[PDB]
Every structure is written in C-alpha cells, then in structure tokens.
Amino acid sequence: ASQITIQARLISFESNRQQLWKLMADLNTPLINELLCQLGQHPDFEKWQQKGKLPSTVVSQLCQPLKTDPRFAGQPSRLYMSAIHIVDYIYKSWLAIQKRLQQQLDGKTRWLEMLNSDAELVELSGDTLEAIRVKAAEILAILSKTLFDAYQETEDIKSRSAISYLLKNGCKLTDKEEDSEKFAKRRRQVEIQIQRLTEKLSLPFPLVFETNEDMVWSKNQKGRLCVHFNGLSDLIFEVYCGNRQLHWFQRFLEDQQTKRKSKNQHSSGLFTLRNGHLVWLEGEGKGEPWNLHHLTLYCCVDNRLWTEEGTEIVRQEKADEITKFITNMKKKSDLSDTQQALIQRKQSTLTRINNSFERPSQPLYQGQSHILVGVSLGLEKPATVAVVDAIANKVLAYRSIKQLLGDNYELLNRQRRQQQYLSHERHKAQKNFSPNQFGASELGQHIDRLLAKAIVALARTYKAGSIVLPKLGDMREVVQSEIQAIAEQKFPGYIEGQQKYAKQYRVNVHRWSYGRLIQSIQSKAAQTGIVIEEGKQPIRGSPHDKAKELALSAYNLRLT
RNA sequence: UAAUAGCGCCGCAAUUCAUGCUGCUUGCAGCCUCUGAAUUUUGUUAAAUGAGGGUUAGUUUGACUGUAUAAAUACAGUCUUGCUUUCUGACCCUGGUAGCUGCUCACCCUGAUGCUGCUGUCAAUAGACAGGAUAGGUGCGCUCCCAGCAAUAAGGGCGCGGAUACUGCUGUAGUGGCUACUGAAUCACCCCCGAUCAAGGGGGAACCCUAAAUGGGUUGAAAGGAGAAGUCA
DNA sequence: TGACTTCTCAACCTCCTA
DNA sequence: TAGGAGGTTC
C-alpha cells in the first residue's frame, strides 16, 4: 500500500464548466445531503453504532428510489454512484462520529444506571473484589483478544465491575490489592458524561471515480493531455499539470492505449491510476462559481506500479487477494444470477493479470531492519535522531535538529515565532472574533516534511532497517516532563523561579505539532521502503541519550 | 528622560568530547584544525540572528533512453505544463472615494497578552509635506520592560435622570468590520507590447565559450498526499 | 480558529453506439 | 471492430 495522489488543473470552456457546476452543486450535493439524513433516521441506525460495519449495500438501497426523484434526476451513472459512494463514506465518517456521540451517550446512560461505587457495590452486588479479580487475572493473563472482547461484553453489575477492576488494577502481580477507585471513578466519570450528554443528547462534494477507466484519456491536437469522464463524454477537460507530475499523466494515456491495442487483453487494475476525485478548489475574487473556482483532478496513483519490478508485487497482491475472493465465494451454494457475474469477473482478472505492460526496471532495495534509526521528539529540540547498532551498542551517528533541517533552520525559528504570534492572536480572539487564519500558512507542514525527508535519507544512508518513533499518545507527558526537567536545570530548588520559568518558556517555546511529523515520517518511510516501529521515549536524559535509548528499547521489544 | 531585570533566540568565546580530526595500534592513542555534540557565557570597535503591509502560470529542484559508474553521481542524448507549498532576492507601498454597519464613552481611580512609539521638514498645536522599513528598550525580539494614552481588560468607587431587566448623560466622538469602485508594484539579468479558465512575442546588457557571428551558452534555490467528515481545546 | 481522530484511494462485463 | 456509458458488487 503506497497510494499517493497527484493533481492537475482542468481547463475547458465556460459552457463545459457551467454543466459540471450545475450538475454537481444543484443536484449531486443535495443527493448527498438527503442520503446523509435518510441514513441517519434509518431504524437500524443504533444497530450500526454498536458495530463498526455499516452494511455493504444499504447506502445503495436508499439511492435507487432516489435516482428517479424530481429534484435528484439527470445525474450520470458515475455521478449517481459517486454520490452513493459519497454518502457511504462521507456519511461513513459522519455517522462514525455520530455513533461515537450517540452510542457513547447510550452507554453513559447505561453505565450510569448500572455501574456503581464500592459502597453501592457492597450494598447491591456485594462480592469480594480480590477473589474475582485474581480469578479473572488467572483466566486472561494465564490469544487474549477473546478475553478482551469478553471484558468488552460483560455488562452485569458484579461482572462488569469486577472485570473492569481487574483490568484497571493492573491485571497482574500488584502488591496493592486495593483501589476500588477504578470503578468508583468509572461510575463517577460516567455520571458526569451522561449529565453532559443529557444536556446535549460554498463548494460541492467531490466526484470519486472508483474505476480507473471512468477517466478516458486522449491527446489534444496540440499534444496536450485531455480527459472526459464516464457519463459525461461531451465534457472534455485539458490537463494543465506540472512537469514533475507529467510522467504520471503520460503514463495514464500510454496505459489506456496499451489496453486498447491489445483488444482489452490487459487488466485495467494494473493501471498506474487507481481512482480520481474531481474537486473544485476555491478562488479569490468574484464571479460565477464556475469562473472563479478551479476544477482540479486528484488522481490516486499506486506508486509501486511505476516500475515493472514493482508491478509484479502488485500483480502478486491482487492475484492473491482475488483468488481468495474466488474460494470465499466458491463455498456458498446460493449461486445467484448476478453473483456468478461477480465470480466471472474474478477469473477474468487473473487471466488478464499475467499480461505485463512496459514499466521501468528497478532492483527494489532489500532492507535489513536490524539497524534502528531512533527518533526522539521533544520541546527544546523539536526532533533529534540516533543511528545506533542493536547487536552492538555503538551509535553510528547522531544528528540534531539544526543538522537535519539543513538551511531549513531559519524556517524552524520563524515558525516558532509564527506559532507564538498566532497563539497570542487566538487567545486575544476570545469568543467573538473574525476568522483566525489571518497570517497563517503551511510553514509547519513544510518543516514537518523537510524533517521527514532528512530523517528517511539519513536512515537510507546507513542502510537502516527501521525508523523508530515515539508513541503519539505519550507526547503530552513527555513535553510536560521536559519542561519540568528544563525548569530544575535552570532553577535547582527555587520552586517559585521554576514555575515562573516554566510559564515564560511555555510563552515562547510553544508545543510542536507531533502528529503531522509522525504522519509525514510514516508516509516518507513507507514510500522509500523503511518499516517503522514504535517504542517508549525515556523520561529524562540528554536528547541524544533519549534517542539512543528509544532506539534500543524498540529493538528490545522487537526481540519479543 | 527612560527602558532596568526576566524570558526566548542568535552569534562570540571558553571548556569538555566524538558522530569529528588525525594516526594506525584497529579499536585504542592523541587532537580540537574543519565538521558536529554537550555544557556555560558573554553581547566586542562584532559576529550571527532579525516580526510593517503587499506584487510573478517567476527561476531552481524534472521524466525517459544511452554511457561511465555497484550504486549515488557525472555526462550525453530526447522531452517539458503552468499544480500545492517553503525560502532567498528584487520591487512596490505606507492607500483614496462611496456607502452599510459593530462596539465604547456622565465622572473618577487602579491598569489589562490594551493601544500607540520611524527619519526629516513645517508647525511645534494636531496635523500636514517629503521620505520610509533601520521603526521605543537590549546583538535581536517578546505578552517582558520604558514612555505617553487608556471609555473600548477586569475590578472598585460614584453623580444625577428614568425604570425600579436595567437604561440615559454619546460626538463619527474614537476604533473596528463589510461591500463597491479605484492607487502602486504584476517581477527573478533588464526593458517594452501582450496574455492571464491562457500567449507569448519582441528588444537590450554583463559575462563565458567563441578572435568574433541576438552564433551559442550563463545572469537564486528547495519540498510534496489530497479531499471529506467528526471530536477536543 | 488550532490541535487531534476517522474514513476515502474498483473493475471487468456488458450492452450500446460509430 | 473500437470505444462510451452504465451496471453491480461484498
């Protein structure tokens, strides 16, 4: 899985864009709005929230009686299926948050009604917690996924209270056979949250085209690349890309022509194009929306398919997941009419997958993960690295933040200054204020990408097999402890001065964005081929020592 | 006149070290000369930082094929489109006229993450006019500090009216926001005519090659994953 | 507004036209 | 015969 997206503006006639704006802003988004509302008031909605799996076909079923509606008609099949898909996945994320809120409220009402304190536990249930806690401990600690699911399932007052007590007490050899505070705070926090939940119980949507061939490519008489989409072939758009992204688009036309010249003996499905959104960006100025906003294509390209050697890897992934799909469907005896069509399409792909298109030749680097580049995140130094051997105990080479961001350091300093300025402005914004993006930029993202590129390049230089990153959850405790450590480093025991310096430090050296950095490193390493493991950053020590010990802890846990 | 102190940065040291340097002794010995790391420690007649607002489908970071090359990388060949960004420059500016609106003010007192703070010129009024990013303080900034103002922090006091949730003492008066039209730059060696849902076309200069031929070249660089939704603050 | 979190990332088989 | 648009699916 190395999916990446390229983009290119689409230029066409005004009449060619008035059709696309009206078709989408007036008919396709309202279909998504109505499909979202209907999926919410569906009777089975609370059944879905209990699970994480909205049914495969439900969003489609609510759309078939909606395609013929007076206000949702005239949409191309791809436009309709895109809207359905939009409702499934846009409303997917929507109802995911929905069942978080709705089902959390339901559980809080329920836990409030059932879970109780130690005193009420003794009064109603009255079971000795040590005995049942130790029994459950010897049941689970002595595939524990089944046991954790069982804990997730047990809801009776005594059973849920005792199993949660065992889970939160350490579920292990703890000499303190105490702390009814576990389910006490459980019920208390539940009551507070149920109180809260009792009190509180201009751009159209994109066009996801899940089929690669729904975009048909052609070369203009001037040599420019052109696109027209399935369902709208009278609408022709010209690809205004950049030369860096051009070799993808020339690959699209070449790949499509190659399938044509073989009389569809080639499997679109090894295409370097997987799908493509068709969004409208936002323009500055005035005017009818089609003349202001720039239509933009967002093609998702599996970068692994570019090389011929990489294609065989994809050729092996699909030929394995699909031959399993066949066997999974071959055990059933239902033998539906259109089901056998689906069965038919599968063996068609297997036969069509062994016909190779011309792709470049690359000896994909083989990575031995024994080397462990360890990356340490903090406040004073935003990020430091340590290339350390694990079989030995020597550090091959450290690099600090001033040394990974070559010529990008002034960027870090001015980004810290900007993050100070923007935070002061947001605090000054109070509750009533104009939009707070005034003066904001994506300098933080540029730095979080420059840093990931350098870290991965350093890993590749030393043949590193893995890059180790701190768990993002432990990034508030770590920064708080680093502030404390700096405080006692400056003021030894003068507590007043320590607090004052902590305040003044938080004023200037703001918290970094340790989510975009971990995500950008995950993207870059995955693109290059370096697997990423996660360890536990040590609480104290010098940043270089913290990085080295993180890297070693990662290997120690890998040994398990 | 004053900016003390604090806090963050950035050098500059100084020391200790290796991820260095050096030596083979090949994992030890030195060394700090570069490169870093880690302290602390100054703010030099200075080193490096450096935050008023804007302007380019700017340039550079590119693809394929071949060669050298294990690779990188180099070189040659062929192609080239303008996306979204981060810088570095260069340049422009310190806006106007119209409307529509928001807030805040009887009067005190403290003083906020409050506002203001440039150079001349003419006043010395409170404002012009010229300049203009060097712009109160420190090497450089700050919510810190200094100076004025402070009704537009919050709190306290407290006069008269009307009401008996709260009002009035309030002038565009001061500061905001919005829209519409306008002012300048509209760029990447420079200049001119143009495109800007598309368009480039010309004309110079320096330099290099070349004696010399708009003969050719060259006249800043980098990075990519985008959409949607929800939650927290 | 910032920060976080979740999700998204087809494909050949038809029938139709030229 | 060679595309274009629709169809359907866990």
Automatic annotation (TrEMBL):
Recorded superkingdom: Bacteria
InterPro entries registered for this protein in UniProt: V_Cas12k
Protein name listed in UniProt: Cas12k
Organism encoding this protein: Scytonema hofmannii
